[PDB]
Design an enzyme around this catalytic site. Sequence first.
Site, PDB file in Angstrom:
ATOM      1  N   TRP A  52       0.748  -1.283   0.000  1.00  0.00           N
ATOM      2  CA  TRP A  52       0.000   0.000   0.000  1.00  0.00           C
ATOM      3  C   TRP A  52       0.772   1.325   0.000  1.00  0.00           C
ATOM      4  O   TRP A  52       1.521   1.619  -0.950  1.00  0.00           O
ATOM      5  CB  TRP A  52      -1.005  -0.008   1.153  1.00  0.00           C
ATOM      6  CG  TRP A  52      -0.493  -0.659   2.381  1.00  0.00           C
ATOM      7  CD1 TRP A  52      -0.291  -0.083   3.606  1.00  0.00           C
ATOM      8  CD2 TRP A  52      -0.072  -2.014   2.499  1.00  0.00           C
ATOM      9  NE1 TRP A  52       0.244  -1.008   4.480  1.00  0.00           N
ATOM     10  CE2 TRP A  52       0.385  -2.202   3.824  1.00  0.00           C
ATOM     11  CE3 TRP A  52      -0.048  -3.100   1.615  1.00  0.00           C
ATOM     12  CZ2 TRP A  52       0.859  -3.427   4.284  1.00  0.00           C
ATOM     13  CZ3 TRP A  52       0.410  -4.313   2.074  1.00  0.00           C
ATOM     14  CH2 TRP A  52       0.861  -4.472   3.400  1.00  0.00           C
ATOM     15  N   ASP A  53       0.559   2.113   1.057  1.00  0.00           N
ATOM     16  CA  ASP A  53       1.216   3.419   1.280  1.00  0.00           C
ATOM     17  C   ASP A  53       2.638   3.547   0.719  1.00  0.00           C
ATOM     18  O   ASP A  53       3.566   2.939   1.245  1.00  0.00           O
ATOM     19  CB  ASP A  53       1.269   3.695   2.776  1.00  0.00           C
ATOM     20  CG  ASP A  53      -0.116   3.772   3.395  1.00  0.00           C
ATOM     21  OD1 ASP A  53      -1.153   3.661   2.699  1.00  0.00           O
ATOM     22  OD2 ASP A  53      -0.188   3.951   4.602  1.00  0.00           O
ATOM     23  N   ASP A 208      -9.608   7.194  22.443  1.00  0.00           N
ATOM     24  CA  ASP A 208      -8.810   8.202  21.798  1.00  0.00           C
ATOM     25  C   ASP A 208      -7.774   7.538  20.855  1.00  0.00           C
ATOM     26  O   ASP A 208      -7.403   6.383  21.065  1.00  0.00           O
ATOM     27  CB  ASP A 208      -8.104   9.008  22.883  1.00  0.00           C
ATOM     28  CG  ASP A 208      -6.880   9.600  22.374  1.00  0.00           C
ATOM     29  OD1 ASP A 208      -7.058  10.003  21.228  1.00  0.00           O
ATOM     30  OD2 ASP A 208      -5.808   9.646  23.029  1.00  0.00           O
ATOM     31  N   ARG A 213       3.123   9.728  12.590  1.00  0.00           N
ATOM     32  CA  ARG A 213       3.594   9.035  11.412  1.00  0.00           C
ATOM     33  C   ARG A 213       3.595   9.867  10.127  1.00  0.00           C
ATOM     34  O   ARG A 213       3.001  10.956  10.056  1.00  0.00           O
ATOM     35  CB  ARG A 213       2.691   7.806  11.230  1.00  0.00           C
ATOM     36  CG  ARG A 213       1.211   8.182  11.323  1.00  0.00           C
ATOM     37  CD  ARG A 213       0.283   7.054  11.733  1.00  0.00           C
ATOM     38  NE  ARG A 213      -1.020   7.186  11.078  1.00  0.00           N
ATOM     39  CZ  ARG A 213      -2.185   6.789  11.597  1.00  0.00           C
ATOM     40  NH1 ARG A 213      -2.245   6.230  12.805  1.00  0.00           N
ATOM     41  NH2 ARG A 213      -3.298   6.926  10.887  1.00  0.00           N
ATOM     42  N   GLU A 309      -3.697  11.881   8.220  1.00  0.00           N
ATOM     43  CA  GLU A 309      -2.738  10.926   7.696  1.00  0.00           C
ATOM     44  C   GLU A 309      -2.039  11.145   6.339  1.00  0.00           C
ATOM     45  O   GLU A 309      -2.668  11.639   5.387  1.00  0.00           O
ATOM     46  CB  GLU A 309      -3.531   9.652   7.561  1.00  0.00           C
ATOM     47  CG  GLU A 309      -3.273   8.511   8.407  1.00  0.00           C
ATOM     48  CD  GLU A 309      -3.956   7.361   7.758  1.00  0.00           C
ATOM     49  OE1 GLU A 309      -4.855   7.659   6.945  1.00  0.00           O
ATOM     50  OE2 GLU A 309      -3.612   6.197   8.029  1.00  0.00           O
TER      51      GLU A 309
HETATM   52 CA    CA Z   1      -5.899  11.615  20.288  1.00  0.00          CA
END
Ligand code: CA
EC number: 2.4.1.10
Length: 439
Positions: A52-53, A208, A213, A309
């Site tokens: 992927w990424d 949370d 990254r 992201e």
């Molecule tokens: Ca957070």
Amino acid sequence: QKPYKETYGISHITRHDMLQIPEQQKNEKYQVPEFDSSTIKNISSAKGLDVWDSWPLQNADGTVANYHGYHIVFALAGDPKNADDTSIYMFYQKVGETSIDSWKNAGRVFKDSDKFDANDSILKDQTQEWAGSATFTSDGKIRLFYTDFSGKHYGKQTLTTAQVNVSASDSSLNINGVEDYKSIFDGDGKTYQNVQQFIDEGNYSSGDNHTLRDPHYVEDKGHKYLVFEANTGTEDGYQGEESLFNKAYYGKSTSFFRQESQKLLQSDKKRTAELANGALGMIELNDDYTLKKVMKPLIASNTVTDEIERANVFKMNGKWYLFTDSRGSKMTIDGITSNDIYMLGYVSNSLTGPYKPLNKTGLVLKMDLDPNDVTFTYSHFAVPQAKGNNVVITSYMTNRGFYADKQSTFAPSFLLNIKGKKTSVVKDSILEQGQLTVN
Ligand SMILES: [Ca+2]
């Protein structure tokens, strides 16, 4: 508590903005393209691995790079059946080719033996190699940054780097080894979130989300930074109940907020909100690539969603664009369903200062295709070029782990027109299964 508008010196993703994105995201100028499957094939080089990424070893400024008559790339890559097997392999092509089959895979960048030989405390707990960037140094080196995370210390994401000693030949390109292997950053606590504070909520149970990254390496006046996916630390206004009372996170106008803040919390999700405190961040480096300054985050998705992201940013035709991919799924904005998925854009006159959405919503690209679709595509990445108003949108097609002869591959890159502070998917631009350019 009562109302406060505080913006912490930085820009943010007002919710207002995020509220046109359900009407405007239906305009096609803003819509990833229906791709053709009878086309899509997988990767020779990979071998049944899902992939992927990905990033391209690029220059100082953004453009892909020529590391020796060679286009180069860097993908996550796992054994389809393993949702916890991540590793940075290194595919690569020739510099005159387009064809998917032009991509020899050069092997896992790292030796299992590596995290240790390294001598980096935080590094021997690494249990997964996540995503980053890859510059290509003025002194002809390959400098990689990526996510040093571990499922043993509660998913601590750390800022990692390394040089990719490697040798090239008129036909192939092998990987002798790596060095200058160290981890730079793990979050500083007042400005960004370190894995300790995610544990204070209980960790995952808490609900949370902790992310650190996708460091994007860039530089402006010879100062060379790292811009990433993150979470507001404890002074740059932070996740809390408090949280929902700052008008900086609503925008538009007071009285607007008063509705929304009200709605809201009277929610079915006061909470997924209080905890959503994410950011695209900044820090400075030394030419030895060690942290030099922690800088103020560049943006926050305060209340909208705790996980921006695949952060990007780069100078193009004179002004600074900056980006990110995110799952509507995980945001709190009515009209943005769990099928929604995005890449967002902000622009500014100066890398570090102040980013106003593009399109007026910072929406730049939406994508919905059912998850089962073979043409799902995630992580869309805006690759800059030598010049022109277009940049090349990369992504990886088809989902990690769904089909059984279909595998996380490169989905056809394509085009995107950008000029001023408006963008627009360029009509009928589908290029090759992974084109990083056009020249
Ligand atoms: Ca957070």
